């Protein structure tokens, strides 16, 4: 399968592309995110929609919406990407370094992500579980145009690559691909087509 | 499977040495276990047959052999013994040895029929009725065995007569009231065609057919309707592979029952049964080998179509098997030729009755295309229905052109039903519908082409044939024709904008007194609603404008007026184009109000007061979405 694997893993471009596209769609659709330590009647649900323009983030101190996102220009409708330095994830989050009343507990370490914008104010966020957290940071890295850091993302990429190479190889069944590609037959150096083109 | 535990079986097999016991053995055969019976079914049959030959004169023994054999075949018909039923027919064709069992058994059963009201022969005749097929396989085989054993049947008259007086026993038994023997009549109807193919070996098909016809006209015509439906159905099942000699003698009587079923208000048992009739008869008549019937197909048309069409006036309800009846007569359409249609479809009674007929058929068609009678999964059946309805309406198109067109001095207004029916049918299965799968376009075009294309060109040649009465018809059809032009198809639309020029030219002739203002007004209206809907596209309006503009160049100054009006149309269009694209692009508020005030202004330009108001209403709807009591008030 060595030539087959060469052929397969050489034509990547579109697979990670589509996975990142899906991540982007996930951020655009968005859902109710969690604030910090939503305890004293604080909204553990509030939405953050990536723009239809993909230029603003519809994040705002919205209420406990079990449905999910409510569509409007949120309490903080703007989050341009031109200034998004990064997102601190895990212990790197300032909300994970808080030792005051907002001290995030030990059950939010993987729910730790705060978008770096303005270099001082971080969208100190908490996730409902690991997978959507990884997807959020994935899509944000897609806004940064970098790699996807969900384990399930690499799952999707490998399985799509395997299925795709599976769904191409049909015709060369009963035939082999030499590791060195079979010799290109010497074309007639004259471009002369005795019968017309097409 | 070979060992036997019963004195009775050994005695009956050994009946020849047990001759004093034959009468007693013929009744003790009943208590023999069937499992033991089919161990020596062959020998038991040979025993009984050689009995009722060796003392056929003693009709007591023939009767008891009859009774015992009938009881055995009834027992073998069991699922346990349905595997030895092939063994039983093996005996029939091979191991049978009775040279007069045909005479003897046809005789005994003629007695059973002529004496059916007897309640001791009632069960005997019944049990003979259930297996009539088996019993006269045996008997027709005994007849031919006699033929072989004697070269020629000197009983050649005798047995075929025994059959004929059995016909007459049928007729006299069932001429009696239904109460005594309703179940006997039912079994006769059921298993009588089970034996007609048996007797096809040794009887004339036509004489047999008419003997049954006599039996069936010995019917008092209000007894066991679906049952005789079954009877004829099993009849045409067999015995019709030889079609041209009984088809023409039974279809008389059978269209008799059909026209009785036309509307007797008692079809409620016979609805599905008659549809089944139609089914099997359309099969067999359409069965290529069963027999040529094209002229008899036309006979069927002339004697069954006004019939069944008034009957579907009756069965015009969607909930029942209306769809199955639809399948019936459209199968008829399929199996049939315009040589048959225009023969008398185009040549019915007085023009008023035929136009009433076409009113019926056309409203029915328009009511089937609406609230379609499929599950939407029947694109196959959809296409079938399309083709057959196409066939029917084509025939009605020729009758329209040759009997109600300029041909007729008046009543050019079935054409309303014609055109609108055709369009409403035409308004499904479009290019996006073709676009479901990638092969879907290909699948349809290969297997069906584009039905829409024929539909449209058919209607177009009809339109060109209308000639003057376009004016007398334009406002009625302004709406539908714009839609058919909307169809994503390039070619029908390309042919259809010139039809727009056609009727605006006609109203240009009418513009001597008036103008196409009603035409263009309705056109504009429907244009508004339709482009709101969102079928057409940009290249589409391009085609529209190119065509109509060009055609009006081919015409005069008022066609230049119609040109600038089509220009207004195109402006309108592209306004709706970019309008809707924003409507389904931004989904903000402000851009929506932007485009809507623009188009509103455009109505203001065109003074399309009503629709102008309408989009004013949409716009104020936007403003009290925005609570623009200010703007909403304005």
């Amino acid at each position: 399968s060595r030539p087959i694997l060469e052929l397969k893993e050489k034509i990547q471009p579109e697979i990670l592309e589509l996975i990142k596209q899906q991540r982007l769609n996930r951020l655009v659709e968005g859902t109710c995110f969690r604030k910090l330590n939503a305890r004293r009647r604080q909204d553990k649900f509030w939405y953050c929609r990536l723009s239809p323009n993909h230029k603003v983030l519809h994040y705002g101190d919205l209420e406990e919406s079990p449905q999910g996102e409510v569509p409007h220009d949120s309490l903080q409708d703007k989050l341009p990407v031109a200034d998004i330095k990064a997102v601190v994830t895990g212990k790197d989050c300032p909300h994970m370094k808080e030792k005051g009343a907002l001290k995030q507990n030990k059950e939010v370490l993987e729910l730790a992500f705060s978008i770096l914008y303005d270099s001082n104010c971080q969208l100190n966020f908490i996730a409902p579980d690991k997978h959507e957290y990884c997807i959020w940071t994935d899509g944000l890295n897609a806004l940064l145009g970098k790699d996807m850091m969900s384990d399930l993302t690499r799952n999707d990429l490998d399985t799509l690559l395997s299925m795709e190479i599976k769904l191409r190889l049909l015709d060369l069944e009963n035939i082999q691909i030499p590791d060195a590609p079979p010799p290109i037959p010497k074309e007639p150096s004259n471009y002369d087509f005795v019968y017309d083109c097409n | 499977t070979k060992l036997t535990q019963n004195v009775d079986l050994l005695g009956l097999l050994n009946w020849r040495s047990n001759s004093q016991n034959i009468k007693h053995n013929l009744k003790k055969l009943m208590e023999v276990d069937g499992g033991e019976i089919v161990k020596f079914l062959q020998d038991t049959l040979d025993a009984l047959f050689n009995i009722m030959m060796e003392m056929s004169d003693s009709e007591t023994y023939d009767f008891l052999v009859f009774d015992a054999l009938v009881f055995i075949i009834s027992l073998i018909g069991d699922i346990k013994f349905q595997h030895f039923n092939p063994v039983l027919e093996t005996y029939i064709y091979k191991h049978f040895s009775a040279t007069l069992a045909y005479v003897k058994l046809s005789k005994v059963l003629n007695f059973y029929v002529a004496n059916a009201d007897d309640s001791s022969k009632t069960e005997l005749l019944f049990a003979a009725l259930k297996a009539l097929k088996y019993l006269f396989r045996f008997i027709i085989q005994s007849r031919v065995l006699y033929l072989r054993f004697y070269g020629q049947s000197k009983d050649g008259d005798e047995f075929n007569n025994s059959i004929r007086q059995l016909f007459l026993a049928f007729n006299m038994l069932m001429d009696r009231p239904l109460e005594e023997a309703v179940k006997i009549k039912g079994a006769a109807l059921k298993y009588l065609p089970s034996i007609i193919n048996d007797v096809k070996l040794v009887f004339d098909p036509v004489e047999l057919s008419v003997l049954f016809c006599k039996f069936i006209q010995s019917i008092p015509d209000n007894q066991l309707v679906r049952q005789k439906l079954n009877c004829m159905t099993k009849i045409v099942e067999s015995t019709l592979f030889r079609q041209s000699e009984c088809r023409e003698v039974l279809l008389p009587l059978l269209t008799d029952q059909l026209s009785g079923q036309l509307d007797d208000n008692s079809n409620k048992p016979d609805h599905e049964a008659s549809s089944q009739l139609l089914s099997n008869i359309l099969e067999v008549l359409d069965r290529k080998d069963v027999g040529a019937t094209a002229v008899h197909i036309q006979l069927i048309m002339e004697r069954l179509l006004r019939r069944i069409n008034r009957t579907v006036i009756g069965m015009n309800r969607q909930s029942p098997h209306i769809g199955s009846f639809v399948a019936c007569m459209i199968a008829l359409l399929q199996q049939m030729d315009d040589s048959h249609y225009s023969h008398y479809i185009s040549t019915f009674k007085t023009r008023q009755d035929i136009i009433d007929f076409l009113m019926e058929t056309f409203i029915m068609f328009k009511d089937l295309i609406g609230k379609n009678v499929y599950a939407k999964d029947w694109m196959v059946m959809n296409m079938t229905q399309n083709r057959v309805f196409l066939r029917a309406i084509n025939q009605f198109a020729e009758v329209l052109t040759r009997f109600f067109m300029d041909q007729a001095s008046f009543e050019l207004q079935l054409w309303n039903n014609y055109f609108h029916l055709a369009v409403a049918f035409l308004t499904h299965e479009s290019l996006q519908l073709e676009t479901f799968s990638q092969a879907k376009r290909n699948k349809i075009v290969k297997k069906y082409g584009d039905m829409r294309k024929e539909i449209g060109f058919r209607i177009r040649d009809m339109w060109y044939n209308l000639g003057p009465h376009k004016i007398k018809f334009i406002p009625s059809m302004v709406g539908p024709i714009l839609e058919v032009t909307l169809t994503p198809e390039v070619e029908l639309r390309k042919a259809t904008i010139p039809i727009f020029f056609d009727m605006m030219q006609c109203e240009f002739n009418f513009s001597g007194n008036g103008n196409f203002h009603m035409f263009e007004n309705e056109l504009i209206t429907k244009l508004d609603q339709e482009v709101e809907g969102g079928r057409g596209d940009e290249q589409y309006k391009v085609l529209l404008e190119k065509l109509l503009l060009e055609h009006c160049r081919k015409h005069k100054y008022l066609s230049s007026s119609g040109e600038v009006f089509a220009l207004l149309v195109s402006s309108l269009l592209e306004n709706l184009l970019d309008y809707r694209t924003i409507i389904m692009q931004d989904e903000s508020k402000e851009n929506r109000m932007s485009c809507t005030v623009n188009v509103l202004n455009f109505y203001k330009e065109k003074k399309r007061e009503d629709i102008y108001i309408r989009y004013l209403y949409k716009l104020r709807d936007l403003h009290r979405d925005c609570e623009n009591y200010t703007e909403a008030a304005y």
């Binding site: 069944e173 | 199968a331 399929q334 196959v380």
Partner: protein, 248 residues
């Protein structure tokens, strides 16, 4: 690159690998590009590709594993066994549309149906592989014809797609506009199988006894396979062990 000829003995254009870009109309050509070649050259072939049935591509014959087979494998008897290989082409086009189905099935988080789709997909590709040849008995051929039609129209039912009838022999004969009423009741058969499946997914994929009852309504003789492993009993003598079925 001379000598090009319009011919139809080449339909199965076959690649070798992610093809060279040897011509302007050629790429790292897809492995399953059965290319309808409009022009016949000895060492090369250019015509309507599988991805693009509207564009040529000059493909080397050293890479063209040309097959004379057309769509139907019985015209030149390309069938490994008559009356079957229409199955292989329909299954190929089937998976063609399966491509769109699943590529959408990830867009919508419907992963249960999508995964049962995958496992049916693996089952069908392996059945497809075994029936690349005619090795299985024609009993298995018709059985797998039935099952492939079943799963195909099962996907259609799940997705509101077309209905293919003529249950056996390529699902064409009835959809070959032979009649109306036979076709009518055949599409009635189609809806009957529609209801059978759409009611039986929850009966077989979910329930376990109704499926056995439905099977046993078709079969009457049975054999209870009893596999004696080892006997534990303190007898001290020769033991006769009479094993039979009992009805208390």
């Amino acid at each position: 690159m001379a000598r090009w000829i319009p011919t139809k003995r080449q339909k199965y254009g076959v690649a070798i690998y992610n093809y060279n870009a040897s011509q302007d109309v050629e790429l790292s050509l897809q492995i399953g590009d059965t290319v309808h070649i409009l022009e016949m050259y000895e060492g090369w072939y250019r015509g309507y590709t599988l991805q693009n049935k509207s564009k040529k591509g000059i493909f080397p014959e050293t890479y063209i594993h040309l097959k004379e087979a057309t769509v139907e494998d019985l015209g030149q008897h390309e069938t490994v066994i008559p009356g079957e290989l229409p199955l292989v082409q329909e299954l190929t086009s089937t998976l063609r549309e399966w491509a769109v189905i699943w590529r959408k099935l990830y867009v919508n988080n419907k992963l249960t149906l999508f995964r049962q789709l995958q496992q049916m997909t693996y089952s069908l590709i392996e059945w497809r592989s075994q029936i690349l040849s005619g090795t299985l008995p024609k009993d298995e051929l018709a059985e797998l014809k039935k099952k492939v039609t079943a799963k195909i129209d099962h996907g259609n039912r799940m997705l509101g797609l077309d209905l293919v009838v003529r249950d056996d022999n390529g699902n064409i004969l009835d959809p070959d506009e032979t009649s109306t009423i036979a076709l009518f009741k055949a599409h009635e058969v189609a809806s009957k199988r529609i209801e059978e499946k759409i009611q039986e997914e929850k009966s077989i994929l979910q329930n376990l006894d109704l499926r056995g009852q439905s099977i046993f309504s078709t079969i009457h003789t049975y054999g209870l396979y009893v596999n004696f492993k080892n006997f534990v009993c303190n007898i001290g003598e020769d033991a006769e062990l009479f094993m039979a079925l009992y009805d208390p």
